Amino acid sequence: MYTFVVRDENSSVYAEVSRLLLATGQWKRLRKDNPRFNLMLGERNRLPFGRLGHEPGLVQLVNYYRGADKLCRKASLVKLIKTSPELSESCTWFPESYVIYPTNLTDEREVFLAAYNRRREGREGNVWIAKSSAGAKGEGILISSEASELLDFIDEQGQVHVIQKYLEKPLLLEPGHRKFDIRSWVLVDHLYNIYLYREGVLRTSSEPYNSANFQDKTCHLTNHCIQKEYSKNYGRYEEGNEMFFEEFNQYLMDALNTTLENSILLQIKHIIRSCLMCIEPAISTKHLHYQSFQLFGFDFMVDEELKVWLIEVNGAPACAQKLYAELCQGIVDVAISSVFPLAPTSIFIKL
Amino acid sequence: MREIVHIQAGQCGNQIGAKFWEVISDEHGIDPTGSYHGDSDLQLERINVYYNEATGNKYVPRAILVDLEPGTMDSVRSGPFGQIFRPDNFVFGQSGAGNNWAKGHYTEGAELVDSVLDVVRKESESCDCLQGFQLTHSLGGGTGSGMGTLLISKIREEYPDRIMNTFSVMPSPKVSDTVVEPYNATLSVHQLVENTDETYCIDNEALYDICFRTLKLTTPTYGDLNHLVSATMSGVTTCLRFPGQLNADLRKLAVNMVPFPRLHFFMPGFAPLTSRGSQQYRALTVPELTQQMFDSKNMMAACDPRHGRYLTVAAIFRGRMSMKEVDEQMLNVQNKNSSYFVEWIPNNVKTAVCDIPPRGLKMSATFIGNSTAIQELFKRISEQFTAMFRRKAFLHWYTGEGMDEMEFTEAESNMNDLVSEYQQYQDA
Amino acid sequence: MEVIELNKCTSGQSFEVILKPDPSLEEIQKKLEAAEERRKYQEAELLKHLAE
Amino acid sequence: MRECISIHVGQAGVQIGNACWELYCLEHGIQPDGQMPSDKTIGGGDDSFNTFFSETGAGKHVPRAVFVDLEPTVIDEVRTGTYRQLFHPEQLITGKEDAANNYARGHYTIGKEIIDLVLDRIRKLADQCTGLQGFLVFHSFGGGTGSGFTSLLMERLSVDYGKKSKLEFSIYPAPQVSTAVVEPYNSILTTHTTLEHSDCAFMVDNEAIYDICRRNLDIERPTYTNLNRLISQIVSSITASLRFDGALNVDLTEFQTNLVPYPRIHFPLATYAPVISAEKAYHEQLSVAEITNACFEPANQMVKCDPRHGKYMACCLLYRGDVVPKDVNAAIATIKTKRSIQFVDWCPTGFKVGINYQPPTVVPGGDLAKVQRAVCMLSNTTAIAEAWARLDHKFDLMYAKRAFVHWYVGEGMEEGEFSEAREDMAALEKDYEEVGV
Ligand SMILES: C=C1C[C@H](C)C[C@@H]2CC=C[C@@H](C/C=C\C(=O)O[C@H]([C@@H](O)/C=C/[C@@H]3CC(C)=CCO3)C[C@@H]3O[C@H]3[C@@H](O)C1)O2
Ligand SMILES: C/C(=C\c1csc(C)n1)[C@@H]1C[C@@H]2O[C@@H]2CCC[C@H](C)[C@H](O)[C@@H](C)C(=O)C(C)(C)[C@@H](O)CC(=O)O1
Ligand SMILES: Nc1nc2c(ncn2[C@@H]2O[C@H](COP(=O)(O)OP(=O)(O)OP(=O)(O)O)[C@@H](O)[C@H]2O)c(=O)[nH]1
Ligand SMILES: Nc1ncnc2c1ncn2[C@@H]1O[C@H](COP(=O)(O)OP(=O)(O)CP(=O)(O)O)[C@@H](O)[C@H]1O
Ligand SMILES: Nc1nc2c(ncn2[C@@H]2O[C@H](COP(=O)(O)OP(=O)(O)O)[C@@H](O)[C@H]2O)c(=O)[nH]1
Ligand SMILES: [Ca+2]
Ligand SMILES: [Ca+2]
Ligand SMILES: [Mg+2]
Ligand SMILES: [Mg+2]
Ligand SMILES: [Mg+2]
Ligand SMILES: [Mg+2]
Question: What number does CATH give the domain D1-268?
Answer without folding.
Answer: 3.40.50.1440
